[PDB]
Design a protein around this ligand. Structure first.
Ligand SMILES: COC(=O)c1ccc(NC(=O)C(F)(F)F)cc1
Length: 130
């Protein structure tokens, strides 16, 4: 229905706003673009499904997300990829892991504050019906 298409348009507006607020935070610069294959040739042999905030924006516009649960799987993948690729005790790896955990925690906190649980439930029931 037209009303269901309006629901998914409001979801996209909400997800673009959350993603922009993450992408402008200085702590999260390393997560804003894909890893450069020239500077890190081993990245795509270790990490099987790369993800970053520019690709998340592209996916919103391609209508890949029908629920906030769908979106948070990709935020969780940005964080888990960083923890997997950078697991050592040295300061550069510990700084990237701290920032990845802060990206995940910040996204979940904005959603807890600003997503209506009945809006999410409506998106999930339309998705289930298709
Ligand atoms: C999400 O970002 C990453 O997981 C990540 C980014 C860069 C590098 N490495 C270099 O820049 C290098 F090789 F030049 F030291 C390692 C991991």
């Amino acid at each position: 229905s037209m009303q269901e298409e309006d629901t998914f348009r409001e979801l996209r507006i909400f997800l673009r706003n959350v993603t922009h607020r993450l992408a402008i935070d200085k702590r999260f610069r390393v997560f804003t673009k894909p890893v450069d294959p020239d500077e890190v040739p081993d990245y795509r042999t270790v990490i099987k499904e790369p993800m970053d905030l520019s690709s998340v924006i592209s996916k919103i516009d391609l209508h890949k997300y029908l629920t906030v649960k769908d979106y948070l799987r990709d935020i969780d993948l940005i964080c888990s990829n960083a923890l997997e690729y950078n697991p050592d005790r040295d300061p550069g790896d510990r700084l990237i892991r701290h920032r990845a955990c802060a990206l995940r925690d910040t996204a979940y906190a904005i959603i807890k504050e600003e997503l209506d649980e009945d809006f999410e439930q409506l998106c999930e029931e339309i998705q289930e019906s298709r």
